[PDB]
Amino acid sequence: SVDFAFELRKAQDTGKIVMGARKSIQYAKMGGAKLIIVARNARPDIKEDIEYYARLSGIPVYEFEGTSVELGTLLGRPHTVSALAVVDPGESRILAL
């Protein structure tokens, strides 16, 4: 079974993820990510805007059922993270989400 927290840290420390709504949206437009993850309390424009382009680009979107503050903590960051793009899963199974 897939554990979200464990696979995300593994992606972060062994693959390549980029954090932020604006960069995620940019990656979605370019077809440049294998998965986007958004926080449950990310702003609706961020959700909808990411979903708009990720759907068109064929990039799955996964909703993290926690807050952007929690998402930042998981990623060892002091600020909230409302969305991130997985460019390379690395050694993780995060794409199994």
| Residue-range domains of the chain with CATH | 1-97 (3.30.1330.30)
- CB-based contact 64:3 (threshold 8 Å): no
- Helix, strand, coil tally for the chain in percent (to 5): 45, 20, 35
- Whole-angstrom distance, CA of residue 35 vs CA of residue 95: 7
Around Cβ 43, how many Cβ atoms within 10 Å?
Answer: 14
**For this experimental structure, what is the resolution in angstroms?**
2.0
Determine if residue 88 is left, alpha or beta; phi over 0 gives left, psi from -120 to 50 gives alpha, anything else beta. beta
Experimental method: X-ray
The radius of gyration of the chain's CA atoms, rounded to the nearest angstrom, is: 12
